[PDB]
């Protein structure tokens, strides 16, 4: 079944706070409650514990991530840039 047309996870808020605010909250809530594959062990068991803290239930590893996503695009771009600018210094 579907149980809902568009409100999705944001249906717990009823008719309150306004549609635009409900959509904005839903956008972050979906990613913040989603499950993620562990980079270290490969299991789909990484979940958010605190605002910027993501832990794997299987391999028990904890990593520092984004507020509502495990990795932010800024950090990914910074990692790529760091690798490039470090390799051009090393060799």
């Amino acid at each position: 079944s579907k149980r809902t047309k568009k409100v999705g996870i944001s249906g717990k808020y009823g008719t309150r706070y306004g549609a635009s605010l409900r959509k904005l909250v839903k956008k972050q809530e979906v990613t913040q409650h989603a499950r993620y594959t562990c980079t270290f062990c490969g299991k789909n068991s990484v979940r958010r514990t605190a605002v910027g803290i993501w832990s794997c239930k299987s391999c028990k590893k904890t990593m520092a991530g984004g507020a509502y996503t495990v990795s932010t695009p800024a950090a990914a771009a910074m990692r790529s840039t760091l690798r490039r600018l470090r390799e051009i210094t090393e060799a």
Binding site: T37, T39, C41, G42, K43
Partner: protein
């Protein structure tokens, strides 16, 4: 290399392999392992242990660039595989290089 996937598919189709850490260690101990594959995201301690076992067995090691998910998919399974051993390479030439 990219050809490792085709070689692995041929080896599984024709020869025989063991998938998993315990079976790989058993093969290395018994000396019937011809080559071992270790996934990139294998834990460092386990990877070093497997490398030491293969040094003892004089068995070649290939460091598969993919994760355990990708290694299992290459082996044609629906589960992950952190490490595996090839006990018999058949029509494939995986042991040539």
């Amino acid at each position: 290399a990219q050809s490792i996937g085709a070689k692995l598919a041929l080896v599984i189709k024709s020869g025989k392999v063991v998938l998993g850490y315990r079976s790989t260690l058993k093969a290395l101990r018994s000396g019937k392992a011809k080559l071992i594959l270790i996934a990139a995201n294998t834990p460092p301690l386990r990877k070093s242990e497997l490398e030491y076992y293969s040094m003892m067995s004089k068995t070649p090691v290939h460091h598969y660039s993919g994760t355990n998910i990708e290694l299992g998919t290459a082996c044609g399974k629906l589960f992950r595989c952190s490490t595996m051993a090839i006990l018999d390479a058949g029509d494939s030439d995986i042991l040539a290089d």
